[PDB]
RNA sequence: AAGAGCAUAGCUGUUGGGACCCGAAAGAUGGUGAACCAUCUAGUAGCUGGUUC
RNA sequence: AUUGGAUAUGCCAUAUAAAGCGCUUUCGAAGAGUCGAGUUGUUUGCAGCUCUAAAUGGGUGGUAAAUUUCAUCUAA
RNA sequence: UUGACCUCAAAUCAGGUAGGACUACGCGCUGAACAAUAAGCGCAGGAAAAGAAAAUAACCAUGAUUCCCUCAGUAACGGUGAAGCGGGAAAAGCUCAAAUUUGAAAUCUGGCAACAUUUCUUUUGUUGUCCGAGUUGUAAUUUCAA
C-alpha cells in the first residue's frame, strides 16, 4: 500500500493486524486416528480393479498409459496424479 | 346429566376414560403437542438459560 | 398480476403499532439493539461508514465481555465478520465501551448487586441507541499546511507508469525468470 | 467408536467385500416385498448420522425402485403413502442390481410418547412437517427443486406494481 | 445363495467368520466369563443403597468395594479399548447380520497383536452380559488367581484358533 | 468556449396491453354420453356492419 | 369471570453442585453411488444412463497463466 | 429333554394414527394449444416456503433468510432479462453424526398403586413399583464461531 490506487502493492496504507486462524480452515488436516483407520480399511478392503490394472503398468514401467487411463477413470488431472503417486508409494512399500 | 356425571366421578383419577367423556375441542388441538412437551428441552439448553438468560438493562440518556 | 398499493397507509400504521407494542412489551430495555461501525465493501462506497450486523469475536475479547454475556445484555455478535485493520478493532471497541458505560443492568433475584451489574434501578429509561450511540461518518481533515514535497510529486510519475508497471509486471516477471 | 471404520468401508463401493455383500443382499431384497419393515438398518452409521437413534418411535423401511424424477424421491413418497401415519425423517441408499435401486428410509412416529418428549425431534410432531416429500422438503427433495444458498441457484416479474403516487 | 456364494468365492475377509472356535475352548472361555458377569440391575440397586450410606459417611472406601472386575462389551466401547490396547481377550459374534460391523475387527486386532477369537452365536454372548444381544465381548483385566487360566486359554486360543487361522 | 435541466398537471400523436364496439372455421386441457359440456378465449378479424350534441 | 407476566410476600428446594472466562505442554474426529466427469432429455438447475473421487482435501471466484497464485466458504 | 436368540405369522388383545372437505394465499409433479401459464395429480399453515454461507466480492472489505426502493430495462442471451453493491422493513439464534462413563445405561415407552394439577371431574403431569425397549448404543460433554 503506497497510499495509492494502482500497482501490485495497491491499497490504502495501514497497519494490518495478524488475524488468527479459524477452525473452518482446519479441514483437510490429517488425524493420526483417521490416518490409522484409512490404513486399516486400505489393508482389509483391497483395491478396485482400475487401480489394480494401472499398478503393474507402473511395475512394467508403463507410466504414460497408466496416467492416461487413470485420467479417463476419474476425470481430472489432479485426481489422476494424486492417485498414481499414492499407488507408487504402495508399490515401493510392498 | 345424571348418568354422565355418575360416569365422571366413576372414572375420575382413572387414566383412560370413554371417548364420549374425553375433551372435544377440535381434531388439530387434540393432536397438537401438549405444553409440557412444548416446554421440554435438553439440559444443554437448561444450562444456557440458567447461566446466561436474557437480562433487564437500559441506557442513560 | 397487478400489485396495487392501496394498503400503504395501512401497512405503515401496522408497523407503528408493531413498534409501540414491541417497545411497551420490553419497555425497560432499548427498542433497537446496537450495531458496529462498518465500511461498505466496494470502491464506490468504501469511504462511507454504515452499521453492520454484529461485533466480531476479536472486539468482544478486547472489550472484556464474553460472547455469552454480550448476547444476554443486547450486544449482537457476528461470527462471519473478521476485522483486520486495527482501527476497525478500535472504532468498534470504545463503541462497546461507551455502550457498557451508559448501560445499567438490573440485578437478578430481588435486586442484590451481583458482580458489577448495577445498584440503582429507578433509572429505568428506554432511550434511542442512535442518540447516545450515533454512527459518525469518516473524520475528514481541514486546514493542513505545507506538503510542498508533494508539490514536486507530479502525480502521473506514480499513476501513469506504476499503472503501466502493474500492467506489465506479469510480462516483466516472466522475462526475469526466463533469462535466469 | 466403531463408526469411523464403517463409512470408510462404505466409501469403497467397488471393493470385493462390498461387491459380494451387495449382490447377496440384493438377491434377498428382490424376494421380499417391494417395501418391507427392517428390524435394524443395514448401515447403522449412515442412518445414525442422518438422524436415526435406536429408540422407540424411529423405524426403518427398505424399498426398491425400478431404474430407467429421482429414484431417491420416489422412494420416500411411496413409503409415506404406505406408512401413512408416520413422518418420514430421511432416506439413504443401500444396493443396486441391473434393474433396481434399493433404499432404506427412516420414519419417525409423530404421536408416540417417546418422540414427543425428546426435544431433538419434537419439531417433526408439529403439523407443518406432515408429508414433506409430497411437498418436496426432504434432503433429496430440497436439492431436487434447486434450493440452496448461492448464485448457482417467477411471480416477482409477471406482476405489475402500481404505487399510489406514480 | 449357494450358486451366488460359490460363483464368486467368499472373500477371506468374510470367509474368516464361517470358521470359528471349537466347542471345548468355547465352554472354558464361557466358564471364565461367568466369573466376571456384569452386575445385575437388582444388584445395582442394592449397591446404590450401599453407596447411599457410604456417601453419608464420607463415601467410605472406593464407593464400598474394590474395582468392579467384569467383562467389557459394546462395539464402540471395545473398539476404543482395543485401540488403547487395554484389552487382553476379544470375542466376536460369528453371525452378526450386517457383517460390516465386525468385518474389520479381526484385521484391526491382528495389527494390535491381541489374542482374539470368534465365539458361536450372539445370544450366548448377550446371555453373558444379561442382554438379548452382544455383538462383541472384551476382557481387559482380571484377578490374580484368574490370571493363570486366562493365560492358559489365551495360549490355547493361540494354539487352536488365532495361530492356526492367522491370515490363511 | 462562461452550463439548463429536474419534477408535476393538461392537450395532442404514437407503441403495447381485450384496446372503439360487433361478428369466421377452428385448436388445446379436463370432463359427460354412446357427439356433447366447461374452461383456456374478451383468439387469430390483413375484413363486414355500426360508432351518440 | 378468568387470565399477561412482572412486584412484594410466604413455603419448599437441595446446592457434597455445574457452568462462563486467564492459560494451554495437543488433540482436534467434521456427513460417498456423494462430489465430479462424459452422455441423453427438459426448464446454469434438475433428471435417466456408464464410470466414480479425494484430505490442506473439496466448492467457488479475482488473478495469473491455461496453469497459477490469491481470496473466500466447508456441501452431500 | 428343556431354555434362549433370531425370522415370520395370528388376535373381535391394549393404546394410538391415516383417509375426506376447503384450497384466495404455500410447496411440489405434470403441462398444453402464449408459458417454467390455464387444466390435471399430490400435500400444508395461519401464514407457507426460505434461512444461520461449500454466500459475496477484489474493497479501508461485506456477513442467515424474507420483503420494498435502487441497481436496471443494465449485464447477459437472442424479444427475453437478472444479480453484487447502497438505502429501508425485521432482526435470533442454533441442534445432531463423527471420540467412552467403562468405577457402574447414568436413558427411555408401557402395566399397576398413590400424590397432585386443570380453560377442563373432559386436561396435564409427578412419585413409587413392575415390565419391556436399548450395548448393531439410550444419556452427559462437543459441532469448526469451535
Amino acid at each position: 500500500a503506497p497510499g495509492l490506487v494502482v500497482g501490485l502493492n495497491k491499497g490504502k496504507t495501514l497497519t494490518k493486524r495478524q488475524l488468527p486462524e479459524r477452525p473452518s480452515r482446519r479441514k483437510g488436516h490429517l488425524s493420526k486416528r483417521t490416518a490409522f483407520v484409512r490404513s486399516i480399511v486400505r489393508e482389509v478392503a483391497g483395491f478396485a480393479p482400475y487401480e489394480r490394472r494401472v499398478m503393474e503398468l507402473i511395475r512394467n514401467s508403463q507410466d504414460k498409459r497408466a496416467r492416461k487411463l487413470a485420467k479417463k477413470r476419474l476425470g481430472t488431472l489432479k485426481r489422476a496424479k494424486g492417485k498414481i503417486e499414492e499407488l507408487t508409494s504402495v508399490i515401493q512399500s510392498s | 346429566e345424571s348418568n354422565r356425571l355418575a360416569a365422571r366421578e366413576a372414572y375420575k383419577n382413572k387414566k383412560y376414560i370413554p371417548l364420549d367423556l374425553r375433551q372435544k375441542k377440535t381434531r388439530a388441538i387434540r393432536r397438537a403437542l401438549t405444553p409440557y412437551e412444548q416446554s421440554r428441552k435438553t439440559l444443554k439448553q437448561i444450562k444456557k438459560e440458567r447461566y446466561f438468560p436474557l437480562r433487564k438493562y437500559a441506557l442513560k440518556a | 398480476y397487478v400489485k396495487t398499493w392501496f394498503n400503504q397507509p395501512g401497512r405503515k400504521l401496522r408497523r407503528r403499532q408493531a413498534r409501540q407494542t414491541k417497545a411497551a412489551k420490553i419497555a425497560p430495555r432499548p427498542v433497537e439493539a446496537i450495531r458496529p461501525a462498518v465500511k461498505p465493501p466496494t470502491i464506490r462506497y468504501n469511504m462511507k461508514v454504515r452499521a453492520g450486523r454484529g461485533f466480531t469475536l476479536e472486539e468482544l475479547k478486547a472489550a472484556g465481555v464474553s460472547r455469552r454475556v454480550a448476547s444476554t445484555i443486547g450486544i449482537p455478535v457476528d461470527h462471519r465478520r473478521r476485522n483486520r485493520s486495527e482501527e476497525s478493532l478500535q472504532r468498534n471497541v470504545e463503541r462497546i465501551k461507551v455502550y457498557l458505560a451508559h448501560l445499567i443492568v438490573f440485578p437478578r433475584k430481588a435486586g442484590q448487586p451481583k458482580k458489577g451489574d448495577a445498584t440503582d434501578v429507578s433509572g429505568a429509561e428506554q432511550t434511542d441507541v442512535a442518540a447516545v450511540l450515533p454512527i459518525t461518518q469518516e473524520a475528514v481533515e481541514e486546514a493542513k499546511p505545507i506538503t510542498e514535497e508533494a508539490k514536486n510529486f507530479n502525480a502521473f510519475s506514480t499513476l501513469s507508469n506504476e499503472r503501466a508497471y502493474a500492467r506489465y509486471a506479469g510480462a516483466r516477471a516472466a522475462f526475469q525468470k526466463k533469462r535466469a | 467408536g466403531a463408526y469411523k471404520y464403517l463409512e470408510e468401508l462404505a466409501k469403497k463401493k467397488q471393493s470385493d467385500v462390498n461387491l459380494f455383500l451387495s449382490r447377496v443382499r440384493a438377491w434377498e431384497y428382490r424376494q421380499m416385498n417391494v417395501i418391507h419393515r427392517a428390524s435394524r438398518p443395514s448401515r447403522p452409521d449412515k442412518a445414525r448420522r442422518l438422524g436415526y437413534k435406536a429408540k422407540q418411535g424411529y423405524v426403518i423401511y427398505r424399498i426398491r425402485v425400478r431404474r430407467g424424477r429421482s429414484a431417491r424421491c420416489t422412494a420416500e413418497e411411496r413409503v409415506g403413502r404406505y406408512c401413512s401415519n408416520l413422518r418420514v425423517l430421511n432416506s439413504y441408499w443401500v444396493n443396486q442390481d441391473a434393474t433396481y435401486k434399493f433404499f432404506e428410509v427412516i420414519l419417525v412416529d409423530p404421536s408416540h410418547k417417546a418422540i414427543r418428549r425428546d426435544p431433538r425431534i419434537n419439531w417433526i410432531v408439529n403439523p407443518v412437517h406432515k408429508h414433506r416429500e409430497s411437498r418436496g422438503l426432504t434432503s433429496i427433495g430440497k436439492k431436487s427443486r434447486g434450493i440452496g444458498k448461492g448464485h448457482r441457484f417467477w411471480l416477482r416479474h409477471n406482476t405489475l406494481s402500481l404505487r399510489r403516487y406514480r | 445363495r449357494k450358486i451366488l456364494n460359490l460363483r464368486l468365492k467368499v472373500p477371506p475377509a468374510i470367509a474368516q467368520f464361517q470358521k470359528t472356535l471349537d466347542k471345548n475352548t468355547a465352554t472354558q472361555v464361557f466358564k471364565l466369563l461367568n466369573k466376571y458377569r456384569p452386575e445385575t440391575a437388582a444388584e445395582k440397586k442394592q449397591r446404590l443403597v450401599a453407596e447411599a450410606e457410604a456417601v453419608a459417611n464420607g463415601k467410605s472406601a472406593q464407593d464400598v468395594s474394590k474395582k468392579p472386575y467384569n467383562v467389557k462389551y459394546g462395539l464402540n466401547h471395545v473398539v476404543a479399548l482395543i485401540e488403547a490396547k487395554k484389552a487382553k481377550l476379544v470375542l466376536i459374534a460369528s453371525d452378526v447380520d450386517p457383517i460390516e460391523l465386525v468385518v474389520f475387527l479381526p484385521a484391526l486386532c491382528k495389527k494390535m497383536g491381541v489374542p482374539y477369537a470368534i465365539v458361536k452365536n450372539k445370544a450366548r454372548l448377550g446371555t453373558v452380559i444379561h442382554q438379548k444381544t452382544a455383538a462383541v465381548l472384551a476382557v481387559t483385566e482380571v484377578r490374580e488367581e484368574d490370571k493363570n487360566e486366562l493365560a492358559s486359554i489365551v495360549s490355547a486360543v493361540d494354539a487352536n484358533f488365532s495361530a492356526k487361522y492367522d491370515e490363511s
Side-chain angles (χ1 to χ4, degrees), chain C residues 6-80:
Chain C
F6 306 127
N7 47 353
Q8 202 197 10
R11 291 153 47 61
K12 177 181 171 179
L13 197 43
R14 279 205 288 111
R15 288 151 162 159
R16 292 205 81 258
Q17 301 183 338
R19 271 89 63 84
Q20 282 166 213
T21 302
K22 176 173 184 288
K25 178 184 70 173
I26 46 96
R29 54 191 71 61
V31 64
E32 182 66 26
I34 72 172
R35 305 284 170 186
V38 187
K39 308 197 87 66
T42 202
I43 204 162
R44 174 181 190 160
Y45 298 103
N46 52 2
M47 62 285 278
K48 292 163 36 180
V49 187
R50 65 158 170 79
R53 187 187 174 83
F55 307 81
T56 67
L57 279 299
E58 294 293 328
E59 329 190 315
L60 298 313
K61 266 270 182 174
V65 294
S66 79
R67 46 180 305 182
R68 303 315 181 70
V69 178
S71 296
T72 41
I73 64 171
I75 298 156
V77 184
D78 180 294
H79 56 272
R80 277 161 295 243

Side-chain angles (χ1 to χ4, degrees), chain D residues 42-59:
Chain D
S42 51
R43 309 167 55 176
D45 86 326
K46 189 65 180 180
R48 185 161 182 71
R49 85 172 53 98
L50 283 196
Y52 178 87
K53 319 276 288 197
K55 55 191 295 174
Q56 296 179 357
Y58 295 93
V59 65

Side-chain angles (χ1 to χ4, degrees), chain A residues 26-74:
Chain A
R26 190 96 184 163
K27 185 152 296 175
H29 167 259
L30 274 299
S31 300
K32 46 185 177 290
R33 170 178 155 77
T34 88
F36 173 59
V37 153
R38 263 164 185 137
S39 70
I40 281 284
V41 66
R42 182 90 279 179
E43 164 295 340
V44 68
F47 303 84
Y50 56 77
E51 50 290 10
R52 293 286 192 197
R53 289 180 296 109
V54 305
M55 41 185 97
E56 51 303 329
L57 294 179
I58 330 305
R59 286 190 181 96
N60 62 10
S61 199
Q62 188 141 6
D63 174 311
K64 176 249 292 179
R65 304 278 96 190
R67 178 175 172 84
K68 294 169 82 105
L69 155 68
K71 184 266 176 184
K72 162 67 167 194
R73 279 296 187 174
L74 274 298

Side-chain angles (χ1 to χ4, degrees), chain B:
Chain B
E1 186 170 65
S2 279
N3 331 92
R4 273 173 68 98
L5 270 71
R8 289 179 189 275
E9 61 265 14
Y11 286 56
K12 262 302 293 183
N13 325 62
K14 305 268 206 275
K15 197 160 142 192
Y16 281 20
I17 64 134
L19 310 180
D20 81 35
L21 299 196
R22 289 167 200 221
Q23 65 162 340
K24 176 179 169 67
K25 315 198 159 45
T26 46
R27 192 175 187 178
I29 286 171
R30 278 182 250 125
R31 279 91 171 98
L33 239 211
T34 100
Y36 174 77
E37 290 94 1
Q38 184 67 41
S39 62
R40 287 309 101 187
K41 296 178 280 192
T42 74
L43 72 164
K44 183 174 198 157
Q45 278 77 341
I46 284 171
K47 290 169 165 68
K48 271 183 182 181
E49 90 75 20
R50 166 151 75 233
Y51 300 114
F52 301 108
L54 271 293
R55 300 302 286 282
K56 295 257 284 187
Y57 48 97
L59 282 177
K60 288 178 283 292

Side-chain angles (χ1 to χ4, degrees), chain E residues 44-45 47 65 67-68 72-77 80 98 122-123 131-132 135:
Chain E
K44 165 157 296 305
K45 178 174 191 142
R47 54 152 298 269
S65 48
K67 169 177 245 160
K72 310 285 189 177
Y73 45 101
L75 190 57
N76 300 312
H77 178 31
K122 52 180 79 73
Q131 288 277 334
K132 283 190 286 169

